[PDB]
């Protein structure tokens, strides 16, 4: 978990990618967890992201 | 709608109980202080379309 409070007084535009392997071997090689996930949320934002392996 | 908006009337927010017996109208009116909407955080899916239906 990692958190940032906007203290700039201005709309802080944050960007992030989400990795999607071609195979389950790379999922274990780079991230340990086969059923990995990410969740990025704010006061009025709520999302969960899950790697589609194929 | 007064102190409430569309979402507080339709979900039946406790602060919008005076609006719950309103059966009919010729047009709908809000004010600049129509803040009593959603009373527990999250999102209203297809809100923009729901007020367009109404």
UniProtKB/Swiss-Prot annotation, chain A:
Highest rank taxon of the organism: Viruses
Protein name (record): Hemagglutinin HA1 chain
Organism of origin: Influenza A virus (strain A/Puerto Rico/8/1934 H1N1)
Organism lineage: Viruses, Riboviria, Orthornavirae, Negarnaviricota, Polyploviricotina
Gene, per the UniProt record: HA
